[PDB]
Amino acid sequence: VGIRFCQECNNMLYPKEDKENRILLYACRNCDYQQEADNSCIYVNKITHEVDELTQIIADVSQDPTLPRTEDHPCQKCGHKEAVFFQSHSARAEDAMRLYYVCTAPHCGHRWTE
Amino acid sequence: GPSSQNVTEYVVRVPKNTTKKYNIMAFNAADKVNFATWNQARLERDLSNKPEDQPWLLRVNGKSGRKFKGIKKGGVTENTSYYIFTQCPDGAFEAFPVHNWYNFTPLARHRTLTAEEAEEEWERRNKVLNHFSI
Amino acid sequence: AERGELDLTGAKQNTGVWLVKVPKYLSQQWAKASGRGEVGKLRIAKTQGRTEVSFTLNEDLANEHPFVLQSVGGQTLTVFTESSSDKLSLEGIVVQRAECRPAASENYMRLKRLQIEESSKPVRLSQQLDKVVTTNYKPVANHQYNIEYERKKKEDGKRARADKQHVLDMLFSAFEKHQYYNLKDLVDITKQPVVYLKEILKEIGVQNVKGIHKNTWELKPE
Amino acid sequence: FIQMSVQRIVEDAPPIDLQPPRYLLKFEQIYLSKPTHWERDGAPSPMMPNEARLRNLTYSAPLYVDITKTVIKEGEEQLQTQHQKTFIGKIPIMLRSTYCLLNGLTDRDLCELNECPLDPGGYFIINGSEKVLIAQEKMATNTVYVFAKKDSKYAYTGECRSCLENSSRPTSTIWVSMLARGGQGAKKSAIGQRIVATLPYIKQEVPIIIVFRALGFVSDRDILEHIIYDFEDPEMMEMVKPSLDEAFVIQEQNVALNFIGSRGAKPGVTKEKRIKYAKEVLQKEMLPHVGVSDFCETKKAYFLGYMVHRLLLAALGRRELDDRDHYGNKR
Amino acid sequence: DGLKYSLATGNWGDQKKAHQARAGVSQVLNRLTFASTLSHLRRLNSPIGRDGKLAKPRQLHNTLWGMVCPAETPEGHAVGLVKNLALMAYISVGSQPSPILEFLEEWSMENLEEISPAAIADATKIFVNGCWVGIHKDPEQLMNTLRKLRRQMDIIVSEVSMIRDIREREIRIYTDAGRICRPLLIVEKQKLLLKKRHIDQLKEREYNNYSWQDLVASGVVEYIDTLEEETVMLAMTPDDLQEKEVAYCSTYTHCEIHPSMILGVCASIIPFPDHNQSPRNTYQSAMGKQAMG
Ligand SMILES: [Zn+2]
């Protein structure tokens, strides 16, 4: 899944297979350096698009004045009543209109979806 | 500790003129090159450019063994003057203005020659992908 | 002992040296150092909580700046010296980088004023003038025309058509020097009029295109 | 414009040298005068706007400049001349402007000149007629806007008009375009879409990796850091993966410069001429606003990386497309 | 010859080549009536041709609010292509970015070359006139200092805009000419920056010599660009919102000086325009120009 970078020349490594070893080895055209592939995964594709919007949003977003704030919904981690509510506004967010809440307390870094 | 307890005050002297120009040599942290390991270092103006405008070229253990090319800075004192402070036997600090800044970068390990032929070969590989319908 | 070779004694020593950023106004004051060259004294104070480095200006130089330390991590800094003779030596390796920034010693009016003082003169701008400066002048003759007229009287380009044999000898000398001589070059050589010179050239030579047109006179093979 | 821009345009002029004795001319201080009309006798009379309409006079102010002439005869002797207030031409003056006589005059003075205090002014007088310049809406220069068009073959196009203080007579536009995700060839689809970037004076679109190599940062990691600030997201790496595939071992900066030079609107038969043309086009025609000078090519690479980064965010859908209708975008 | 020729021709190009000459630049002033003369002097021309029927340029837009009068548009084959700027809205002359840049470098600005690529993600980018001069670790600290300096007017003119896109992680400051900025009253936690004491001083200009620039120097009113307006919260009525109620926001950054101010001179002459149909107001804007006076 992650890119592999050549230690010797800092260039991308392309996996190659040798029958005797039976282990995937990353190969560099520029240099002879080779290393085993623990992942052994050549390619990965996800059509799920299930990435959480909470990871995409950040704690600093709550500080914005324009965003509306609800005292009714408290922050679970620090028990702070004030919290900010906004739509996801992200790719593939048409299916879900779920509200996203970020704690307005500074440095709390707590984000939850309601 | 003892260093914190000790307080040292040293006079600073700036020479109006310096006989030898002071320049900065920079080595990449990732390269981790060691001055002690090098058998010798030779510094000359870059052959490809062939004065001060030409970048310094550093060869370590011969040009083939290692190549470093200095990167000239268009303005070194233009944003602010830079002064080199040197420890002295009296201990009074001496400040020297930096005439030029050079950053030395290691040459790519693979090296070799590309030229027009390499560009054509890469185009041919792209054409081979284009030729196949699938 | 070679100009091409770089001395590595400083690199082996790994002597500690400091790279310090100094403001241009402070640098100008430092450049005009008192006497032979003294700018003041530097006081170093170290405490468990923090380390403070400060420099005090000389009273004569004036007639305390805190230093902001900059991390050297992620870079390696060394000092190399180029002599007037081009001899190369290494002073040492920089251990710390610092910036001289005044704290609470400059007013907002100052520093902003200091930039104006550095500029010295405001940028030039269009200036409106009452009335109009005279645009009409009355010279008897143009200066360039008179300079040419004096030159024409002083020097006459060519002379008369005389001593054709002497001119022929000069043409032979040019032909000996080079197989083909440009007609304009020959006109500079001989004072014979271009038309008379062409007739003498025709007798001893034939103009040749050389495949580039622009026929150039050359001596006849016959 | 009259007080400062006219002076700046003459001040920002290269000296003209003709040679072999060389004569050098420099345009320095600009001098301006209150508008005057020349009679048949040749005696000047101050222009009056009401009178100008009656006689069909054009309201204009004389322009003067200081020219310094230095000539070298190749004998190591220089002759210096100081021409001052040399006539350049006449510039029409907008009514009620500080230069215009009507401004700075009391209402009683205006009544004597038969000029209404109520009249707004702000109109140039040409041939005794009233002409007022009309403001024109224009897209902002030195700004990056991303638009996705179905008609365009490229799925996403980003436009960055570039100029420094309108010094260039024609603004230069550089566009970074992401190819459509769908591929006619399955092999092309398997590698992925290629982000070819349009540049000024290029015969065909140049891939981002090739232009990045020409700027510098030959190492693949260096190109990647400008294109993506954070490598945490796999999908952005997958988008740039075909760009990495097209150029790998060919990291030579001069060869990349030759490749753009050969695929260019202007062709140089000698290899050095192609390199010179490619270097100059990258230095000035491409991203002039970031740096007029050759130095700061690394800053130009950072700005080019930002344009690619915005395109990657637009492909993700994380960043919404810019709107032409937005008034702030318009100038 | 060139300057005179271009103004008379109405085409903005050199005499030798008419290919690059612009269309509709410089038009004869209308002297039919005093109101028509003012309307002609303040005019905006769309880059798109009148023949083009594309809906998006012709259609009125949300960002146009406070910068143009919707009622004052000429009817014809092209609709909304010609617009008149709002009376409050002022086109910015523009200022050099070099003095602001000196403040920015002093105020914790880090150059791109020294900064690592990872650091660029960590610290919000700063663009001045669309140029990536530097990045700042804290967006709010730089923004607060810039805005307070703008009220003083010592370093930055009120016309200059300071957009703060925290979500985009970019800070944009524009001193370029051609921006349109409208003065807006600044609102604090529950009160207008403007006070009754300022109004009484303004009423007597005989000795006080109070001026609009004096209010700008006070910082009670600040010019806001359309891009800044996107990041600026606005209050439709100051007294009602300031009084405790279920307001949309209690921290509006700015307040409109007046709703009627957005309307153009042709729109203002019509009585009770809101009661009248919106197309009828547009028709009267054309009638006012051709009215005989
Ligand atoms: Zn490798």
Ligand SMILES: [Zn+2]
């Ligand atoms: Zn919390």
